[PDB]
Amino acid sequence: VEELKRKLRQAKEDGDEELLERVKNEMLLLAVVDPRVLVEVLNTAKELGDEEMYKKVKGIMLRLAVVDPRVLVLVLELAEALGDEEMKEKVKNIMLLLAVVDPRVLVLVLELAEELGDEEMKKEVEEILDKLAEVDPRVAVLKEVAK
Amino acid sequence: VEELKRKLRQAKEDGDEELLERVKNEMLLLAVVDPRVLVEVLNTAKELGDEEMYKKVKGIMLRLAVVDPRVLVLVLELAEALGDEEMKEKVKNIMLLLAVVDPRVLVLVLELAEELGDEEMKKEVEEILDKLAEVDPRVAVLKEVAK
Amino acid sequence: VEELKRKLRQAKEDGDEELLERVKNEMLLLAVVDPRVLVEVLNTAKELGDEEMYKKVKGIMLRLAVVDPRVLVLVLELAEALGDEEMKEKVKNIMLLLAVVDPRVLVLVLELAEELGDEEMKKEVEEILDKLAEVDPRVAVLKEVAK
Amino acid sequence: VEELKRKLRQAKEDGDEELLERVKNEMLLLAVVDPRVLVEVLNTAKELGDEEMYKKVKGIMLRLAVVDPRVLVLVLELAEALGDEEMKEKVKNIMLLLAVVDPRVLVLVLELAEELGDEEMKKEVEEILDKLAEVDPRVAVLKEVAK
Amino acid sequence: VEELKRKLRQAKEDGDEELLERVKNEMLLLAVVDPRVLVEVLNTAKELGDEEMYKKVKGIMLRLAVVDPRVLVLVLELAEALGDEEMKEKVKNIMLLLAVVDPRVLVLVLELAEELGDEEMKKEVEEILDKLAEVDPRVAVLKEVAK
């Protein structure tokens, strides 16, 4: 966090890339397990002018989203907070693919399809539900209640 | 949290929207991942007199509820604490829709149908239980034990 | 919690029931999302001398149990630590209801049926297993292994 | 924890069994929901010489495992760290019983069978796999891959 | 961890291998139950010049991975952060065996199938999907949507 990025800054000013790389990598790993650091380190990576660190952190958080739906909501909001067309495409794909095998996401998506009301989102979701409903009766009654 | 609240307030009394926007957005992002911060970020949003921040934070916590059932009690109690006709509507709806596909919430709904003891709630939950038990024998055993 | 405790104390010496409601409500909500505060706010309510906040906290944590099985052990032990015939009945009921649809609890209760060894517990558990085994084939193997 | 430690030490030094018992019960309850304190409080149980506190804490942290697999790995390592025959006997039973209903453990056991390499472990677990695999189709593929 | 780190580093310079064993087991057990300490306890183990503590911590964290999918992503990054040929070998097998019985992992591996693009890993994933899809319709719809 704050002390790690401060040491990072001072080491980069001193030089010694062999130390700076390890400080950066430990920040990256701490960002994986402690998610409230993700919003920090990410915005740090942009400020240093390092596209590689920023892109790798985007990667880490995006593929961490598929194993932790709270981080999925985080990245789904962050996609709009940045206004990026890589985040806003790949998150809105991993979500509309993860909904198939994780069934509470199949309700988060149904709430987004009215809070955002995206036409393409709704037209995808209707097909998701119609494909699921014939092989999963709980999804059938879910389609009954959502109307 | 305390530091971001202090920063936002001090910026607000000295102006310079370009800093206020960034601090506010980072605070919302932090609140997405740290639910303990939410009850703070919400109230501060009300204090500034900006219904837009407060409304977006209600949005964030509400759609966070459908992917983290710990928050589903937080917002459920917060609806009574505020007495807002949206929270009391949409939170009740996402419960009586999420119960279809996540039975830990189904038992929570069965407990609410007596701790609040609302007639409209129980008489609707009867339909959920019937439609599930008709096509899923485990929920039929649940209906047997809960009666 | 310490700041909220101090604020509640300073509010109590001078009235201001609106301040009391605000601080107490923030304590209640903080207790919903940070379970290690549950035991604190519970007893602070008791020493303060208000049956209503105490019973509301008993409600909040009890219905939080059915959505977070880590708090289930907390309330199950706190029932005996208090000796309250309310907790010791309602928790011993939500377990023998929640086990029907959640199968990790179905081997938590089976540990109580020997570490407490109650006849009621063992009899009810035998009934639960006999009902589930004919409609959930996997649990049949459980009935074979728990021999 | 340090505050509760100082309070219990002062209570022991004076000889006020009521305050000491109460604060120890509060510590026990705190240990239920903040598991990174368990190995601490357990140790304190050995420090005071209270075999009863030691046994109750062993019970709490053991039956907490069947609802939180992180505590399951904790107690699984702690059984070897202590060398207690009850911990080593009973964790290697609640695990080989929890595996039947929770499939994430079914690839935690399968890693122990080689990292600890116990002959009895593998010879017992073969029965679990062969019983599940004929009544749960995914386990058939799980057995096809792990061979 | 920093306090236990300091105590251990002091004990290393004054002997008393029993004190060292004690602080070591303290750090190890704290690491199992609070994952953000792992990357710390690992690196210190390497710095002291004790391959055995480092190997034990690798064991513990890899074993914890199969019951905590966030540590799965942690070790999945750490594998290439070190470059070691056990993590890169064994993590890429506990994952491609855990995916069989965990539906969220089946949409984590499918992102790596392009984020690293390993042809043999893509073939492994196709084999997993083809085996699952004929005995689990959810996976059939997942295969349909993924293309």
Residue numbers in the entry:
A (entry chain I): 593 to 739
B (entry chain A): 1 to 147
C (entry chain E): 297 to 443
D (entry chain C): 149 to 295
E (entry chain G): 445 to 591
Task: Quote the study that presented this structure, word for word.
Here we describe a systematic approach to generating modular and rigid repeat protein oligomers with coincident C2 to C8 and superhelical symmetry axes that can be readily extended by repeat propagation. From these building blocks, we demonstrate that a wide range of unbounded fibres can be systematically designed by introducing hydrophilic surface patches that force staggering of the monomers; the geometry of such fibres can be precisely tuned by varying the number of repeat units in the monomer and the placement of the hydrophilic patches. All multiplexes follow the naming convention CsHRN_Rr where s is the cyclic symmetry, HR stands for helical repeat, R is the number of repeats in a single chain and N is an index to differentiate between multiplexes of the same symmetry.
We determined the high-resolution structures of five designs from C2 to C6 symmetry by X-ray crystallography, cryogenic electron microscopy (cryoEM) or both. C5HR2_4r matches the design model with an overall C-alpha r.m.s.d. of 2.11 Å and has a Vr of 12.6, higher than that of the other designs, further suggesting that all 12 designs are close to the correct structure.
